[PDB]
């Protein structure tokens, strides 16, 4: 499995691909066999058409920005969690959503599982 | 308490952090489920149950001198789970370091921690 140092760099790059709004580059970082539980507690999303309809529904348009708000934590078993924020729109205006994702990386370096922790309690209108 | 709402989580989890910082072990362990598991780190085999979890928090904390604080907001789900970022300041090899951590938890319907995963490694240490 990715080295912890490496799981870090796949996770900071991800915030990169999310932020520039490159949905296509976000959907190659995943596995055939992946789930998106986003937000965690919802069923999970799987299948490459499906997920890709997830990142398109959430980052299509451009107007979503996302940055790490502290360092990626990683393990030695190819996993890792990171804190970040997102600036987007809700109820017509500027909001922000605080987020931690946790990612499990398969033996090919692709997101085998991603889980995304947030809810309202992690929204601030601005 | 029952299965905690998102709001109550956040609250449960900030307190954990304070217990931690002060080093009240009995207290840390009574937040857990009698049969809870801890993986800390994540990637090393669970431990199961209050007796062993207590043995583990003594080993880390019992040295005194560890402090802890959140370094962002608690993130909480609607299914009794939250995740939080924090930093652990200790001493070691006589110098001050610090460790950066995200603890992922779930709770019960009784409001106690069923499970906890602690994401960190040796990549998350930083002996200023
Ligand atoms: Cl942080
Ligand atoms: Cl944060
Ligand atoms: Mg304190
Ligand atoms: Mg029980």
UniProtKB/Swiss-Prot annotation, chain A:
Active-site residues, record numbering mapped to chain: 14, 38
Keyword Ribosomal protein: no
Gene3D superfamilies named in the record: 3.10.450.50
Keywords from the named record: Isomerase, Lipid metabolism, Steroid metabolism
Name of this protein: Steroid Delta-isomerase
Keyword Isomerase among record annotations: yes
EC annotation from Swiss-Prot or TrEMBL: 5.3.3.1
Impact reported for residue 101 to N: Reduces activity 4-fold. Reduces activity 10000-fold
SUPFAM superfamilies for the chain: NTF2-like
Gene: ksi
GO biological process: steroid metabolic process
Phenotypic consequence of residue 101 to A/L: Reduces activity 100-fold. Reduces activity 10000-fold
Leading EC class: isomerase
Induction remark: By steroids.
InterPro entries: Ketosteroid_isomerase (IPR039256), NTF2-like_dom_sf (IPR032710), SnoaL-like (IPR037401)
Residues given in the record as substrate binding sites: 101
Stated consequence of mutating residue 14 to S: Reduces activity 20-fold
From Swiss-Prot, chain B:
Effect listed in the UniProt record for changing residue 92 to A: Slightly reduces activity. Reduces protein stability
Pfam families: SnoaL_2
Outcome following mutation: residue 103 to A/L: Reduces activity 100-fold. Reduces activity 10000-fold
GO biological process: steroid metabolic process
The entry's keywords: Isomerase, Lipid metabolism, Steroid metabolism
EC code: 5.3.3.1
Gene Ontology MF term list: steroid Delta-isomerase activity
Chain sites annotated for binding substrate: 103
Consequence of substituting residue 16 to S: Reduces activity 20-fold
UniProt-reported outcome of changing residue 103 to E: Slightly reduces activity. Reduces activity 10000-fold
Active site: 16 (proton donor), 40 (proton acceptor)
The organism's place on the tree of life at top rank: Bacteria
Up-regulation conditions: By steroids.
Reaction catalysis annotation: a 3-oxo-Delta(5)-steroid = a 3-oxo-Delta(4)-steroid
InterPro entries: Ketosteroid_isomerase (IPR039256), NTF2-like_dom_sf (IPR032710), SnoaL-like (IPR037401)
Enzyme class: isomerase
Subunit structure: Homodimer.
Annotated protein name in UniProt: Steroid Delta-isomerase
């Amino acid at each position: 499995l990715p080295t912890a140092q490496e799981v870090q760099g796949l996770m900071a790059r991800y915030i990169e691909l999310v932020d520039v709004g490159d949905i296509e580059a976000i959907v190659q970082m995943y596995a055939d066999d992946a789930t998106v539980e986003d937000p965690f507690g919802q069923p999970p999303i799987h299948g490459r058409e499906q997920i890709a309809a997830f990142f398109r529904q959430g980052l299509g348009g451009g107007k979503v920005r996302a940055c790490l708000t502290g360092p990626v934590r990683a393990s030695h078993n190819g996993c890792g969690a990171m804190p970040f924020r997102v600036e987007m729109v809700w109820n017509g205006q500027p909001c922000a959503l605080d987020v931690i994702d946790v990612m499990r990386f398969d033996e090919h370096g692709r997101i085998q599982t991603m889980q995304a922790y947030w809810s309202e309690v992690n929204l601030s209108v601005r």
